[PDB]
Write a protein that holds these residues in place. Sequence first.
Motif, PDB file in Angstrom:
ATOM      1  N   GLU B   8       3.670 -14.227 -63.520  1.00  0.00           N
ATOM      2  CA  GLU B   8       2.543 -14.129 -64.285  1.00  0.00           C
ATOM      3  C   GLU B   8       2.795 -13.569 -65.542  1.00  0.00           C
ATOM      4  O   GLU B   8       3.430 -12.606 -65.855  1.00  0.00           O
ATOM      5  CB  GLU B   8       1.403 -13.583 -63.424  1.00  0.00           C
ATOM      6  CG  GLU B   8       1.572 -12.190 -63.209  1.00  0.00           C
ATOM      7  CD  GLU B   8       0.320 -11.350 -63.051  1.00  0.00           C
ATOM      8  OE1 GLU B   8      -0.712 -11.798 -63.355  1.00  0.00           O
ATOM      9  OE2 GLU B   8       0.218 -10.571 -62.124  1.00  0.00           O
ATOM     10  N   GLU B   9       2.021 -14.253 -66.553  1.00  0.00           N
ATOM     11  CA  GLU B   9       2.311 -13.694 -68.132  1.00  0.00           C
ATOM     12  C   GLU B   9       3.538 -13.813 -68.294  1.00  0.00           C
ATOM     13  O   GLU B   9       4.034 -12.689 -68.828  1.00  0.00           O
ATOM     14  CB  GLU B   9       1.563 -12.344 -68.046  1.00  0.00           C
ATOM     15  CG  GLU B   9       0.111 -12.110 -67.825  1.00  0.00           C
ATOM     16  CD  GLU B   9      -0.456 -10.792 -67.679  1.00  0.00           C
ATOM     17  OE1 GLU B   9       0.329  -9.720 -68.026  1.00  0.00           O
ATOM     18  OE2 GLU B   9      -1.626 -10.730 -67.460  1.00  0.00           O
ATOM     19  N   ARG B  60      -0.983 -18.549 -71.839  1.00  0.00           N
ATOM     20  CA  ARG B  60      -0.707 -17.343 -71.102  1.00  0.00           C
ATOM     21  C   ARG B  60      -1.179 -17.637 -69.766  1.00  0.00           C
ATOM     22  O   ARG B  60      -2.207 -18.116 -69.509  1.00  0.00           O
ATOM     23  CB  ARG B  60      -1.633 -16.238 -71.770  1.00  0.00           C
ATOM     24  CG  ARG B  60      -1.618 -15.091 -71.081  1.00  0.00           C
ATOM     25  CD  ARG B  60      -2.290 -13.805 -71.741  1.00  0.00           C
ATOM     26  NE  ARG B  60      -2.456 -12.795 -71.064  1.00  0.00           N
ATOM     27  CZ  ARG B  60      -3.374 -12.362 -70.072  1.00  0.00           C
ATOM     28  NH1 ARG B  60      -4.347 -12.959 -70.161  1.00  0.00           N
ATOM     29  NH2 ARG B  60      -3.184 -11.094 -69.686  1.00  0.00           N
ATOM     30  N   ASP B  62      -2.646 -15.785 -66.229  1.00  0.00           N
ATOM     31  CA  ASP B  62      -3.239 -14.650 -65.733  1.00  0.00           C
ATOM     32  C   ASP B  62      -3.706 -14.889 -64.308  1.00  0.00           C
ATOM     33  O   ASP B  62      -4.429 -15.764 -64.246  1.00  0.00           O
ATOM     34  CB  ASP B  62      -4.409 -14.314 -66.717  1.00  0.00           C
ATOM     35  CG  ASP B  62      -4.800 -12.737 -66.139  1.00  0.00           C
ATOM     36  OD1 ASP B  62      -4.385 -12.245 -65.410  1.00  0.00           O
ATOM     37  OD2 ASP B  62      -5.635 -12.196 -67.063  1.00  0.00           O
ATOM     38  N   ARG B  63      -2.640 -14.419 -63.503  1.00  0.00           N
ATOM     39  CA  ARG B  63      -2.822 -14.690 -62.091  1.00  0.00           C
ATOM     40  C   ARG B  63      -3.982 -14.235 -61.611  1.00  0.00           C
ATOM     41  O   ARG B  63      -4.787 -14.844 -60.756  1.00  0.00           O
ATOM     42  CB  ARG B  63      -1.681 -14.060 -61.265  1.00  0.00           C
ATOM     43  CG  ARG B  63      -1.778 -14.425 -59.973  1.00  0.00           C
ATOM     44  CD  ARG B  63      -1.080 -13.197 -59.154  1.00  0.00           C
ATOM     45  NE  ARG B  63      -1.897 -12.052 -59.133  1.00  0.00           N
ATOM     46  CZ  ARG B  63      -2.788 -11.686 -58.405  1.00  0.00           C
ATOM     47  NH1 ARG B  63      -3.137 -12.434 -57.431  1.00  0.00           N
ATOM     48  NH2 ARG B  63      -3.147 -10.442 -58.739  1.00  0.00           N
ATOM     49  N   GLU B  64      -4.504 -13.249 -61.992  1.00  0.00           N
ATOM     50  CA  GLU B  64      -5.938 -12.298 -61.719  1.00  0.00           C
ATOM     51  C   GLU B  64      -6.983 -13.380 -62.252  1.00  0.00           C
ATOM     52  O   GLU B  64      -8.136 -13.001 -61.512  1.00  0.00           O
ATOM     53  CB  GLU B  64      -6.091 -11.075 -62.173  1.00  0.00           C
ATOM     54  CG  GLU B  64      -5.224 -10.013 -61.595  1.00  0.00           C
ATOM     55  CD  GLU B  64      -3.667  -9.971 -62.155  1.00  0.00           C
ATOM     56  OE1 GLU B  64      -3.331 -10.808 -62.723  1.00  0.00           O
ATOM     57  OE2 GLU B  64      -2.685  -9.258 -61.551  1.00  0.00           O
ATOM     58  N   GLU B  65      -6.915 -14.200 -63.214  1.00  0.00           N
ATOM     59  CA  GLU B  65      -7.736 -15.106 -63.511  1.00  0.00           C
ATOM     60  C   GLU B  65      -8.242 -16.164 -62.742  1.00  0.00           C
ATOM     61  O   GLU B  65      -9.250 -16.820 -62.585  1.00  0.00           O
ATOM     62  CB  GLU B  65      -7.739 -15.303 -65.042  1.00  0.00           C
ATOM     63  CG  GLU B  65      -8.989 -16.187 -65.633  1.00  0.00           C
ATOM     64  CD  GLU B  65      -8.666 -16.491 -66.974  1.00  0.00           C
ATOM     65  OE1 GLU B  65      -7.426 -15.860 -67.525  1.00  0.00           O
ATOM     66  OE2 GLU B  65      -9.563 -17.150 -67.802  1.00  0.00           O
ATOM     67  N   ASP B  99       1.220  -5.219 -63.281  1.00  0.00           N
ATOM     68  CA  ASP B  99       0.606  -5.101 -64.605  1.00  0.00           C
ATOM     69  C   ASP B  99      -0.796  -4.584 -64.562  1.00  0.00           C
ATOM     70  O   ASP B  99      -1.122  -4.131 -65.743  1.00  0.00           O
ATOM     71  CB  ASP B  99       0.626  -6.390 -65.396  1.00  0.00           C
ATOM     72  CG  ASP B  99      -0.060  -7.531 -64.766  1.00  0.00           C
ATOM     73  OD1 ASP B  99      -0.415  -7.460 -63.564  1.00  0.00           O
ATOM     74  OD2 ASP B  99      -0.404  -8.519 -65.455  1.00  0.00           O
ATOM     75  N   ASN B 100      -1.293  -4.335 -63.502  1.00  0.00           N
ATOM     76  CA  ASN B 100      -2.671  -3.744 -63.361  1.00  0.00           C
ATOM     77  C   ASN B 100      -2.664  -2.413 -62.821  1.00  0.00           C
ATOM     78  O   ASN B 100      -2.371  -2.203 -61.602  1.00  0.00           O
ATOM     79  CB  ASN B 100      -3.496  -4.766 -62.578  1.00  0.00           C
ATOM     80  CG  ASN B 100      -4.054  -5.872 -63.454  1.00  0.00           C
ATOM     81  OD1 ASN B 100      -3.543  -7.001 -63.383  1.00  0.00           O
ATOM     82  ND2 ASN B 100      -5.315  -5.692 -64.324  1.00  0.00           N
TER      83      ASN B 100
END
Lengths: 522, 521
Positions: B8-9, B60, B62-65, B99-100
């Motif tokens: 991701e990203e 981009r 974003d997996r969390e999105e 990344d979080n």
Amino acid sequence: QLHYSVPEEAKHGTFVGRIAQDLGLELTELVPRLFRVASKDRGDLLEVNLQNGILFVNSRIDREELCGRSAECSIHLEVIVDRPLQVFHVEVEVKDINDNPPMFPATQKALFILESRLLDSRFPLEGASDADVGSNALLTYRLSTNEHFSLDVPPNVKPLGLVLRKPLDREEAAEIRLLLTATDGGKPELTGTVQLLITVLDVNDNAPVFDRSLYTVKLPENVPNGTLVIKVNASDLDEGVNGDVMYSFSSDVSSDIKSKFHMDTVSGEITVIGIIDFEESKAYKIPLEARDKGFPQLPGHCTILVEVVDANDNAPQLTVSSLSLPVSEDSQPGRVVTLISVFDRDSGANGQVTCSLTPHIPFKLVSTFKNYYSLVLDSALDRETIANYDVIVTARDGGSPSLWATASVSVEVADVNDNAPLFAQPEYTVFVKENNPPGAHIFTVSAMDADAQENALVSYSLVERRVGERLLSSYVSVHAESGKVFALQPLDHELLQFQVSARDAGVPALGSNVTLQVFVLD
Amino acid sequence: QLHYSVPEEAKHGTFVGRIAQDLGLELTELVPRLFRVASKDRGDLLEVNLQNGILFVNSRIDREELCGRSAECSIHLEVIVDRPLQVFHVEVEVKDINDNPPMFPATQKALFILESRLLDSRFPLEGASDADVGSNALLTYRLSTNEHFSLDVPPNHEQVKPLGLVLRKPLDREEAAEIRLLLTATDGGKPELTGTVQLLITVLDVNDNAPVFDRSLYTVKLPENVPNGTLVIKVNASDLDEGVNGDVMYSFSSDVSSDIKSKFHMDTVSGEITVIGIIDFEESKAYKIPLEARDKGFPQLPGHCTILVEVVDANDNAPQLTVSSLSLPVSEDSQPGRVVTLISVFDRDSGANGQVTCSLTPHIPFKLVSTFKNYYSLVLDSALDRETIANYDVIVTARDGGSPSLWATASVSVEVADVNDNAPLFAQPEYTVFVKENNPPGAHIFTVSAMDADAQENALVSYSLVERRVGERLLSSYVSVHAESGKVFALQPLLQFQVSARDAGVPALGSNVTLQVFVLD
Ligand SMILES: *[C@@H]1O[C@H](CO[C@@H]2O[C@@H](C)[C@@H](O)[C@@H](O)[C@@H]2O)[C@@H](O[C@@H]2O[C@H](CO)[C@@H](O[C@@H]3O[C@H](CO[C@H]4O[C@H](CO)[C@@H](O)[C@H](O)[C@@H]4O)[C@@H](O)[C@H](O[C@H]4O[C@H](CO)[C@@H](O)[C@H](O)[C@@H]4O)[C@@H]3O)[C@H](O)[C@H]2NC(C)=O)[C@H](O)[C@H]1NC(C)=O
Ligand SMILES: *[C@@H]1O[C@H](CO)[C@@H](O[C@@H]2O[C@H](CO)[C@@H](O[C@@H]3O[C@H](CO)[C@@H](O)[C@H](O)[C@@H]3O)[C@H](O)[C@H]2NC(C)=O)[C@H](O)[C@H]1NC(C)=O
Ligand SMILES: *[C@@H]1O[C@H](CO[C@@H]2O[C@@H](C)[C@@H](O)[C@@H](O)[C@@H]2O)[C@@H](O)[C@H](O)[C@H]1NC(C)=O
Ligand SMILES: *[C@@H]1O[C@H](CO[C@@H]2O[C@@H](C)[C@@H](O)[C@@H](O)[C@@H]2O)[C@@H](O)[C@H](O)[C@H]1NC(C)=O
Ligand SMILES: *[C@@H]1O[C@H](CO)[C@@H](O)[C@H](O)[C@H]1NC(C)=O
Ligand SMILES: *[C@H]1O[C@H](CO)[C@@H](O)[C@H](O)[C@@H]1O
Ligand SMILES: *[C@H]1O[C@H](CO)[C@@H](O)[C@H](O)[C@@H]1O
Ligand SMILES: *[C@H]1O[C@H](CO)[C@@H](O)[C@H](O)[C@@H]1O
Ligand SMILES: *[C@H]1O[C@H](CO)[C@@H](O)[C@H](O)[C@@H]1O
Ligand SMILES: *[C@H]1O[C@H](CO)[C@@H](O)[C@H](O)[C@@H]1O
Ligand SMILES: *[C@H]1O[C@H](CO)[C@@H](O)[C@H](O)[C@@H]1O
Ligand SMILES: [Ca+2]
Ligand SMILES: [Ca+2]
Ligand SMILES: [Ca+2]
Ligand SMILES: [Ca+2]
Ligand SMILES: [Ca+2]
Ligand SMILES: [Ca+2]
Ligand SMILES: [Ca+2]
Ligand SMILES: [Ca+2]
Ligand SMILES: [Ca+2]
Ligand SMILES: [Ca+2]
Ligand SMILES: [Ca+2]
Ligand SMILES: [Ca+2]
Ligand SMILES: [Ca+2]
Ligand SMILES: [Ca+2]
Ligand SMILES: [Ca+2]
Ligand SMILES: [Ca+2]
Ligand SMILES: [Ca+2]
Ligand SMILES: [Ca+2]
Ligand SMILES: [Ca+2]
Ligand SMILES: [Ca+2]
Ligand SMILES: [Ca+2]
Ligand SMILES: [Ca+2]
Ligand SMILES: [Ca+2]
Ligand SMILES: [Ca+2]
């Protein structure tokens, strides 16, 4: 000078002393001379009889009434005799007897002590009163054998204190009964008793406790306005205002949680006040706090986790993608036509979808990935027999009850040149007028096709033939667009058979020729 | 299917995979035939460049999105090619990178805890949130090293129930007003990111400290005649609490006597003891007063202290004395050393002003002497005479010692009785008379006179006659006299006779004077 000791409260006419013979005076002198005796206080406690010349007790002698609680008691009596005048002063000391018992201000006295009261704390207690003086006065206190309390007395004057040895509790011991005994050291020995009945005051030291820290409750998706979820029950071990608790949410709750759920403060019942959706949120975690009414109030915390069950309340939304208008007639089976994407908002058993189409149709449907379906061609097809299909696709949403979602798709078949232009019937024969004028229509040949557009386009032409080589003329001229046959020569006398060829315009062009004959010899 | 793994990203245009040759398609077919790649969600994350026929990241990722907090993330891309129509489905799984960081709902959280909170009591705390999925999610909590508190976390799973702070050692407001701690949540990913929440817990004052005096008993001296509203002493109570729990009200105990409450009063705020009633030493010698003080807290604790006040005997009472054995008569022949009357002196006061000193007139034969205690007897010494001294008025002065000194005087009237110890005396012996020549019978000749020093019957003069030789001769008894007057009567026309004056008292005493009459006619 002279001292006499007399016991307190003596029998009437108790022998005190031979005062007459002690002062060197006979009865014989005592009788005529005026005998006067005077004393302080009452002055009538003692009296002397002259017949036998002795001193005796007339009335009851209460020492404590005259001298009170003083160490020394003595009665000053003066004796006066006349002719001649003479005065003798005699003092009579009164002896104290233990006739006064240790007396408490009250037989029963109730004290009130808080439960949370720490050790080494003393409580003031009034002592017993005693009119006696000396050894026969109260000096010894004895407290009942108790686990919680011990007695303390200052060595001197000062109220004696009760010291808390072991901590006290209302719940374990609501009331405590003790007896205090005060004994004086005299003969006979007298008793003093005071029974203390102390009551334990409830202190808010018990926090409210739930059955368990976490509860689990199942809840439907489309629950109506004001549906009960669960009622929580809290236990408290105090009394009255300290014993009952009010229920509430914690301050850390989310706005959405507070929006969807509500609790009655008194009852502690949870009701739904907002539309809850399984698709919006699957479960809710709610912290709960309960507080009692006591001033030092303690809280009790427990968190409820409620799970929402997915009910089949959403129809399977499908979209038709990759619209393909043309489908050739010669298309071999196994060719895809259009694409279909089916999605469902619900989840689980009522989330999966099963698609199908019209059974009375050569096409068949097969899926490659997930809920994406692809329309594949099966069996042979002919444009002329069937021109276009309007396939209706049905998507079934499982579960009880099952849902349906239909889609109308228009598919048309493309024309492929596989037919040939055919005249009505071979062969054709016509007979032309003898004196025929030039540029005159004699006959109009006709042809028809099964295909469409350029494949159905008929183009009429002529053959050369040997008779053309015979050199009469280029003979009749035909119109390819209409099929009219034009003659340009008057008939003469000296059998005409020629082939009219109608052809297509498609890339695999196909044509057929019909024989037309004219017979004239006039 | 077909699987490509992409973190991701990633950087723009990151190589994903040669989808062209992987799907059995030549570049020659790829270029003219419309090569389409379409996806759900955004649908613009991946794209293929046709020049070399490869797949790459366009936007981009974003997996969390896309997958949120779900275990598995995969992107469904469909590939459409025309002439002839062909569709190929490819799935690209997105790998999660740490990344979080672990994020708490708030960086700073303040808690309010009571002082009286018992041990084993836990307090609810919200855990940290994490958008990461898998190993790189938070599972380990570390609490700041604290003496009083310890951390507690449920082991089954995270976000099932808020983690609790358990009280290991009891806390106190007076010792520690505020406590600052830090909570660190660490996730198991590489690299490791930390989330932290600073807790500022404040200790609430609970009324658990009882009011205490300096000492259990105090001793104060107080005069007798103190005016209305005189200060005795001010009492001090010490309290270790805060605000309303720290200040106390002063009061009397419920076990005080009514007389005690009548003589003494206390201001609740100040705690000063004042007298509002007249106190007397004879009324009560000393007072013992129990005092109770209570604070304003709801669980209010009492404080007890006893004041012992002593009353001083002030000289405000004169020595009350009574005169006893009143004796009116006092004989002249009374021998010296002989008592006359009795005096009884008593005093209401006690001590230095309790003792009494008696005395009498210095210019007097009488003397005062005591035999026993404060009983005094007035004794007569030396001789006394009725005629020389008629009556005595003895004044007894009693002085009460101390400052100031008191006085008590007494007037006693004693008179002495007359005793016949004197003799009747004529003016001068002797007396001579000459009677008329021609004397008639029964004629008054003279009136004799006599006087005495005594009184009453003892001073009564009675005149009589002696026999005498001339009288014995039988010529006559000469003149005849009246005993009451002493007149001499003649009844006939050298005579020497004795006139005897006598008393009338029981011990009669008399004297004789010579009387002479001369007649020869
Ligand atoms: C879903 O249900 C919600 C409540 O549940 C229902 O109602 C309760 C009473 C039960 O019968 C339960 O079984 C039912 O299912 C419902 O919420 C309600 O929303 C309306 C308005 O949208 C509210 O009306 C207003 O009420 C207040 C009173 O406030 C109370 O709040 C809480 C309740 O516990 C406590 O603090 C008190 O008990 C209060 O009594 C009124 O004051 C207010 O009137 C004011 O305004 C008017 C106009 O200006 C003035 O004339 C008045 O003088 C007032 O100044 C409104 O009437 C209603 O209170 C509220 N219910 C509760 C329990 O709070 C929700 O709307 C439902 N969902 C949908 C989509 O409808
Ligand atoms: C929570 O549940 C409890 C029990 O189900 C409810 O308690 C109720 O009231 C008393 C509380 O002491 C319960 O015990 C009773 O105690 C008395 C004391 O003398 C005794 O005489 C009774 O025989 C009984 O043992 C009682 O079981 C229970 N009664 C009822 C009608 O509920 C409590 O009310 C519940 N919480 C709430 C908020 O309702
Ligand atoms: C009480 O006396 C105070 C002075 O001494 C204080 O009290 C004692 C008990 C100790 O705690 C000592 O350390 C203190 O300094 C006065 O300041 C105070 O005003 C007095 N109380 C009242 C109500 O006036
Ligand atoms: C003493 O005075 C009493 C009245 O006292 C009242 O309250 C006290 C605290 C003072 O402030 C005073 O000025 C007030 O008037 C009387 O009730 C009582 O009878 C008086 N006692 C006497 C005169 O012996
Ligand atoms: C005309 O049609 C017949 C029918 O079979 C065919 O044999 C013939 O070849 C056709 N004519 C030409 C010129 O092709
Ligand atoms: C008073 O004292 C007597 C003995 O002196 C006891 O018998 C009585 O019970 C009480 O203690
Ligand atoms: C003192 O205490 C005893 C024991 O309670 C009593 O029996 C007695 O009458 C007095 O109250
Ligand atoms: C199912 O129902 C829908 C309603 O719009 C139709 O469009 C479809 O053809 C099928 O009959
Ligand atoms: C033969 O038939 C056609 C129709 O197929 C006509 O259009 C033509 O004119 C001729 O009559
Ligand atoms: C938490 O701990 C990590 C190391 O485990 C640090 O890198 C981070 O800054 C925080 O202090
Ligand atoms: C989280 O905790 C750290 C210490 O690990 C502090 O520095 C920061 O301000 C936050 O409170
Ligand atoms: Ca007695
Ligand atoms: Ca006695
Ligand atoms: Ca006794
Ligand atoms: Ca308790
Ligand atoms: Ca409680
Ligand atoms: Ca309790
Ligand atoms: Ca729904
Ligand atoms: Ca649903
Ligand atoms: Ca559904
Ligand atoms: Ca055909
Ligand atoms: Ca054709
Ligand atoms: Ca055709
Ligand atoms: Ca990310
Ligand atoms: Ca991540
Ligand atoms: Ca993480
Ligand atoms: Ca404390
Ligand atoms: Ca405190
Ligand atoms: Ca206090
Ligand atoms: Ca006085
Ligand atoms: Ca006095
Ligand atoms: Ca005096
Ligand atoms: Ca005399
Ligand atoms: Ca005399
Ligand atoms: Ca005389």
